[PDB]
Symmetry: C3
């Protein structure tokens, strides 16, 4: 292992900065391991360590403050987070968005939400890098949080740049398309236990580079309307309506995207008495997405995240 160690607050308070953030606007423990991102681990209690854009971070919070420290993978000396680095963290947690106001609105139109959301405040959507989000959720088919976390970790060690080692944890940045598109990529990824998903990863990387003109295409979908972005993602190998809706909600700034599968069907039927007006089909899935947009409004995906967090 490495002589360099995971930081805690009160081990090294010189190296931590703070963002003013109520625990009611963000609970790290509900957002960082609830199946949005698969790159955060609680390495010591209340201290969440993980990768953002080829930098490792540790995060912890009091009732009113979000405390962050950053580790850089170069000669540069151990330093407290910069202003620009704090701003990318403010963007990542979309803290511009008032969760208090959204919770109020959903509770006003949905009695079920009002009962369940009391114990589950500070559930918001991370704003993820599209590349990371796409290839993460391509590995999401027929999977659970624990197994995906493993696949993504091994995928990053194999294809992503080595950043730094803290204790016995070696941190890698998320691979670029070129690394995942290479001739060995599928064989290698299959060894790492991706199974059939290994093909979709290589094929989607090749497709975006050759057919769509690189990662600037995923950035175009961030600006494009929800419907255009969703259809465009669904043309990729391994990406159907569910995965396209996850990416839309979590990386392409489409707060109205409602990823539908057996889990959402179960909630809808049990808690709302919903049946299709036309069992899961492509058309009924779209109908159930529309139902939740009609009920909750243009941040329907965000309301869904609160119900998922409350069901788990």
């Amino acid at each position: 292992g490495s002589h360099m160690r995971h930081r805690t607050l009160s081990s090294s308070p010189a190296l931590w900065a703070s963002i003013p953030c109520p625990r009611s606007e963000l609970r790290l423990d509900l957002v960082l391991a609830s199946g949005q991102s698969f790159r955060w681990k609680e390495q010591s209690p209340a201290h969440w360590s993980g990768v953002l854009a080829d930098q490792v971070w540790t995060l912890t919070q009091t009732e009113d403050q979000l405390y962050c420290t950053v580790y850089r993978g170069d000669d540069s000396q151990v330093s407290r987070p910069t202003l620009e680095e704090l701003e990318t963290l403010h963007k990542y947690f979309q803290l511009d968005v008032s969760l208090a106001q959204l919770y109020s609105h959903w509770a006003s139109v949905d009695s079920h939400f009002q009962r369940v959301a009391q114990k589950f405040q500070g559930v918001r959507l991370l704003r993820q890098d599209p590349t990371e989000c796409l290839f993460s959720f391509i590995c999401s088919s027929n999977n659970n949080i624990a197994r995906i976390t493993g696949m993504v970790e091994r995928l990053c060690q194999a294809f992503g740049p080595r950043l730094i080692q803290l204790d016995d944890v070696t941190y890698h940045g998320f691979p670029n398309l070129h690394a995942l598109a290479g001739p060995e990529a599928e064989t290698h990824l299959r060894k790492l236990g991706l199974g059939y998903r290994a093909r979709y990863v290589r094929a989607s990387a090749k497709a975006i580079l050759e057919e769509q003109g690189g990662p600037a295409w995923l950035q175009q979908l961030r600006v494009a309307p929800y419907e255009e972005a969703h259809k465009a993602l669904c043309t990729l190998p391994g990406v159907g309506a569910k995965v396209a809706d996850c990416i839309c909600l979590m990386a392409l700034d489409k707060p109205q995207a409602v990823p539908v599968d057996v889990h959402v069907w179960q909630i809808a039927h049990r808690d709302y008495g919903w049946h299709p007006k036309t069992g899961p089909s492509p058309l009924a899935n779209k109908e159930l997405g529309n139902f939740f947009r009609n009920l909750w409004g243009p941040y329907a995906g965000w309301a869904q995240a609160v119900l998922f967090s409350a069901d788990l």
Copy 2:
């Protein structure tokens, strides 16, 4: 002299008791569960509110219902009897709970923690205009509208602490030319017109209160149809009044809340989303399951769902 809300230890000379197990009646489940909007717990375990132009305070032990009335004398026999009628204590809740539990496994699991849920026997006039006055969302907003309505149009009875108690208005007061303008200011919106119109309609039809009293004796089906001819009264409101004021224990008021319970807890779908015909079907389902006190069994499930 400044008069205060009584407690049982403070002035026990002025309290009478009715023998009543806490299993036959829990005041805390019945008096602020959206049947009546005129009871507040002004001090702990002590419920104060208006019955027929008199203020009462109510509290209970495990075996006794303690009541005091403000008109300095203890409640009379006739006054105790109107309170016995109000809580319909002739009806054995122990026997009903037994019967429902015997035919309904779900009820048996849920009703354990929620004993003493019964239906108040409300004045028809107060019940009708209370439930017309509701957007039918929340207890708090209706409680406000009814309180302000009573201060504006009802006779002043007494003041206890900083609470001024008014009796419910008579039909004449709600039927007047000013009634709609006034009620609109009190925030009723378009419902203010249905209140005035329904008051006029009931007065026009024989004796005002005497018509609603006829519906109390009339069969459930006749009473329900008759209420539905009133401005602002549909099947749901007519079923509330039937169950709560017209002695129709089989009345099952149906809306999205009952649909949710029925579907989730009983696996019920219509055999023909909410429609008038499907709502009637769901009412029939619960009468078939629970029997002639279906409305009372419903009240237990509502009390157990809200907690």
Copy 3:
């Protein structure tokens, strides 16, 4: 009686052990979850009841199943053959850890519920006892059936032993339940209409089917043949026949369906018939759970029942 219910600290000379993880068997989830109606927790963590005309007390640690047997005879610790009949009764040859894994892999709902409810397995019951027990199961709950079976056994079954104020009787044979008095007697013991089905089914197995060797033939016969054969008996429909199949005739795929399974299926799985409870829709719901969980569907059901009853 001068003879008392044993506890593990009171008389450890008379107890033997079977190596058995609490993850493979929780007595407290299996012995009063409506499979058998003959086990009571007479002292905490100590389950006393009848197996094959012998009384047992059972208790467990995290890794061991501790058993003592009461036989007049010299007070002795359980024999090897007696331990083996207990190993058969709990079907401990079957890996519950492997089955739980398989069900959890194909069913997210099961995975959430089965965490707190491990060691739910199916007892292997005597067919006669299971048949007449579950004939009394129509329009009934665990508490009321436990009473009917207890009174039935005292009235018609041989006295085995008394421990404290509890007199233990073996289950009656068919001949005892088939007599001219049987229905009148059983009606007094509070069985109601079920008293008729008990006498009639006893008569039917003796006269029409050639005695209890018929129930042993159904244990060897395929599920579907055994089920149809049970359904020819008075008071045995699809639900009771499926209970007997699962709990006594070694048919792990049998899924007893009634209003209780309908409720779980609809609420927890969003299932509707691809067509309210009917004979055909009940069969459809049984097929749904066999399709989902595989050939041990009945065992997976038992886990959900144990988790629903809490």
